[PDB]
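Researcher: Going back to the complex we discussed earlier. I've cleaned up the inputs and rechecked each line, so this should be the final set. Can you rerun the prediction on the complete assembly and write out the structure?
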Amino acid sequence: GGRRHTSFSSAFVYPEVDDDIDIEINPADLRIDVYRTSGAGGQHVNRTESAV
RNA sequence: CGAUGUCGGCUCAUCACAUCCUGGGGCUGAAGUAGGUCCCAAGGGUAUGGCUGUUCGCCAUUUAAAGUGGUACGCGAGCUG
Ligand SMILES: [Mg+2]
Ligand SMILES: [Mg+2]
Ligand SMILES: [Mg+2]
Ligand SMILES: [Mg+2]
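Model: Rerun complete. Updated structure for the full complex:
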């Protein structure tokens, strides 16, 4: 029993065009701190500053 | 290898200067206050705690600053385990 329907539709547009991705992995930043581990491998792992 | 005992903490330190603070200066994108940077300088000073066995670290609250390291990563014929 066809009656007047008031239906809608959306049309969103966007370019989506880029080539610029910056991780900023420049080592002027990124302070590095080295320390030793908890220690389970005897005398060696407590002496080696392995963690970072 | 017919013995050179090991991290951390406590204690006691001592020297180096690539100096965290105080002192003396240059330069400044230094008006002033407050900072940045570099040079000279080691005389003295150079946190208390929550969490972890932890050094470190994170966090809270300060302080003029809560320096970086060597010293069997100082110290078990001194201690803890
Ligand atoms: Mg000034
Ligand atoms: Mg304590
Ligand atoms: Mg602490
Ligand atoms: Mg000891």
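Model: Worth noting: DSSP finds no helices and no strands in chain A.
Researcher: Good, that matches what I expected from the previous run.
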